Design a protein around this ligand. Structure first.
Ligand SMILES: O=C(O)CNC(=O)C(=O)O
Ligand SMILES: [Mg+2]
Ligand code: NI
Ligand SMILES: [Zn+2]
Length: 331
């Protein structure tokens, strides 16, 4: 069995190997990369996402989200307060202001310590989930707006033809902006490219151990657990590495830098934070190996999770017994 300790693997494809996306995902899996829940892919030196970022300040962040925490430093939830629209140029200036800028620090480890000590005492503003792409149309390799669609994968594997679309999303971050513990919708894969700026630190639980994290989360957030049998789908709960280690939960960590891809694998729980002003692009995707995870994915039906249009078909075809309850939570 490859990668039996479920370590995060780092890949350096050559320019030839970078041509065929599906083939390279299958290669990484042949080496056991999925067992970690997360892999890093460093593009070949000949590749570029686009020519320059000199022209991005005019993008609009229609609904910036202020991430307000409640709890203790290692076990907290966050809620998103909507703020007035601002441009990327306005948001970058805000990120760099004295109130929001990254503090002086020695190295990534010192910064990580400061994040977990102090996160709860601040409310950073995140420009998340903005439909769009920063890949040049002429970039043919690993262009996240030119991937094979999840609908097409389901049609090819299962023969059924469904509505829905699959497009990328932009994320503008600042110091302390936070992504809560989650798996993807329908336990899909994700791929994330850090276009520019400061790093992103990730934490991940191996898919084979995801239910250990779920059981800890039910203990740590007991009112939330009574509210919903899949409350991690709400994407609001944080648990620190120190608390994970105290409770024996297997996990790994890695820091992504600008120019690097990360892939999350089906049912790989992940969480993390941004080091300073940055911009990432991410999208969900499927492979044949995903289908069994899609069939078994948990679902929130309490109303909180609310998701895209395109998840309807996935539930309807893969989980017909659950469909009626889940759709009530959508409506
Ligand atoms: O970058 C972020 O804030 C969150 N991204 C992801 O959870 C992902 O790419 O799957
Ligand atoms: Mg612009
Ligand atoms: Ni994710
Ligand atoms: Zn719920």
């Amino acid at each position: 069995a490859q990668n039996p300790n479920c370590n995060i693997m780092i890949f350096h494809p050559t320019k030839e190997e970078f041509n065929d996306f599906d083939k390279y995902i299958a290669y990484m899996e042949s080496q056991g990369a999925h067992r970690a829940g997360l892999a890093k892919i460093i593009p070949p030196k000949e590749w570029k996402a686009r020519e320059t970022y000199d022209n991005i300040s005019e993008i609009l962040i229609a609904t910036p989200l202020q991430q307000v925490a409640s709890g203790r430093a290692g076990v907290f939830t966050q809620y998103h307060k909507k703020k007035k629209a601002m441009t990327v140029g306005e948001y970058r200036h805000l990120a760099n202001s004295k109130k929001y800028q990254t503090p002086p620090h020695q190295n990534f480890e010192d910064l990580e310590r400061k994040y977990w000590k102090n996160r709860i005492y601040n409310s950073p503003i995140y420009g998340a989930d903005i439909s769009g792409s920063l890949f040049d149309e002429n970039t043919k390799q690993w262009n996240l707006g030119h991937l094979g669609t999840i609908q097409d994968l389901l049609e090819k594997e299962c023969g059924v033809v469904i509505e829905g679309v699959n497009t990328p999303y932009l994320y503008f971050g600042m110091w302390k902006t936070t992504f809560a513990w989650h798996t993807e919708d329908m336990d899909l894969y994700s791929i994330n490219y850090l276009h520019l700026g400061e790093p992103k630190t990730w934490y991940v639980v191996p898919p084979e151990h995801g239910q250990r994290l779920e059981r800890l989360a039910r203990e740590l957030f007991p009112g939330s657990s009574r509210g919903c049998g899949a409350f991690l789908r709400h994407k609001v709960a944080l648990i620190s590495p120190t608390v994970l280690k105290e409770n024996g939960i297997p996990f790994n960590r890695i820091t992504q830098e600008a120019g690097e891809f990360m892939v999350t694998f089906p049912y790989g729980y992940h969480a993390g934070f941004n080091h300073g002003f940055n911009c990432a692009e991410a999208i969900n995707f499927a492979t044949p190996r995903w289908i069994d995870y899609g069939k078994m994915a948990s679902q929130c039906s309490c109303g909180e999770a609310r998701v895209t249009f395109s998840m309807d078909a996935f539930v309807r075809i893969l989980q017909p017994e659950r469909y009626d309850l889940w759709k009530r939570g959508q409506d």
